[PDB]
Design a binder for this molecule. Sequence first.
Ligand SMILES: [Fe+3]
Length: 106
Amino acid sequence: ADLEDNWETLNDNLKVIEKADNAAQVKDALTKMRAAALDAQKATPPKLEDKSPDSPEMWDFRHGFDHLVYHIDDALKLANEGKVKEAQAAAEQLKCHRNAAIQKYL
Ligand SMILES: [Fe+3]
């Protein structure tokens, strides 16, 4: 899907996490964030379409999503341990990584 679409999918699941009561609801929404992050990583923006994969611009674009995914995975570790509130606090911190990965390319 579109980059704008994946940014919305991430924003929708972050709200779900903030409103969640249990770890399984957090786990589900983080799972869907990870999928959207890996999808967004494929949605090369038009201004970058003709860049080489080896290019520094494409390194920057792709690795913003590796970093988002890294911390989604860390949050999933907390959810799978049933630490709902800790996982919710990690998710709040995903907003900054999401911004860093997506904002300047929209
Ligand atoms: Fe990090």
